[PDB]
């Protein structure tokens, strides 16, 4: 990670380059980030999950 100091400065650079501003809410996200990491959508799990479905629904016969 870049430290909070660095990331806040990067954001301020990103804003002023488009005549925008770093809001209080965005500064808060940078200083104290909330953990939204995609724990439940990781590639290996997703790839296997989707391959389980294709594999089940074709080489399992349904009688109805």
């Amino acid at each position: 990670e870049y430290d909070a100091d660095t990331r806040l400065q990067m954001a301020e650079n990103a804003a002023s380059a488009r005549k925008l501003f770093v809001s209080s809410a965005l500064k808060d996200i940078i200083v104290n980030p909330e953990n939204f990491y995609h724990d439940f959508q990781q590639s290996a799990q997703m790839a296997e999950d989707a391959n389980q479905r294709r594999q089940v629904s074709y080489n399992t016969k349904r009688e109805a």
Binding site: E1, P33, N51, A64
Partner: protein, 313 residues
Amino acid sequence: MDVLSEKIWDYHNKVSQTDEMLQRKLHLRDMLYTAISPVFPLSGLYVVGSSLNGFGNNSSDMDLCLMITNKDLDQKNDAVVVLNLILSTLQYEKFVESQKLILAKVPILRINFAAPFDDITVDLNANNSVAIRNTHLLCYYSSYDWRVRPLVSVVKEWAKRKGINDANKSSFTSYSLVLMVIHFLQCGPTKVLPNLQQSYPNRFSNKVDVRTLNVTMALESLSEKTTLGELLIGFLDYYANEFNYDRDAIHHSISNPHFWRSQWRCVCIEETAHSIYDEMVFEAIKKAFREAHGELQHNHDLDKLMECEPIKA
């Protein structure tokens, strides 16, 4: 299986998202997350749309949502700062070839790539969490019944060839077709799908924290076992009627602003000007829905249906 249902299922397995394509896309996501996370630590990068909603037809497009906060993120200013900061970051990644910041109600970073990923185009938004909730919802509709998925594949392919799903902005999006099928399977003559939002409000609401969403968790009429071919035939018949469309906003002119892009958006979790041209195109689409119904009902031949002439608009 009857011949029509068999040809539908076979077509489905041939045009649906392949394992290889999905793996490439997920890898690309992880590569993008590795480059982005130093600038937004503890953030999430979620796949949304057809790539992971259970209805993928191997399109080179991929939509991503970067989650950084549990509140709504202001899209006019803050989302643009975020996306601009990401644009600056990805300029130094050599696997990224070009970028474009697209301003809209929900601003988008469009990314193109070098290496063996140059066929894939990525659209990235900043914390538009409704896209994740709806990807999650559609994924459970896609696995509620074994008929939903092959019934979406052929329709997508038919609409594409028929010109009902087109590049020209006066046509239904792929996403609209999915909602149209689901709406049909919910409100049509044969009740195939319930309203998941009403049956499981705590799981499929908009108040739902996207961090608690996990598609690997399979959670719990049915005299119904009408065939796949009969569902397709009924679908075409259903939208042969103007009163079955989402025409009105909250002569039935196309008053609904979301008509083309999000037909029957009330199926999903809730997130300008039409002309006489849109109406004309809509009229043509109804006629196509009437032709293809007469065709398939008479022959039950998916191939003849599939080599249809495109619509004129």
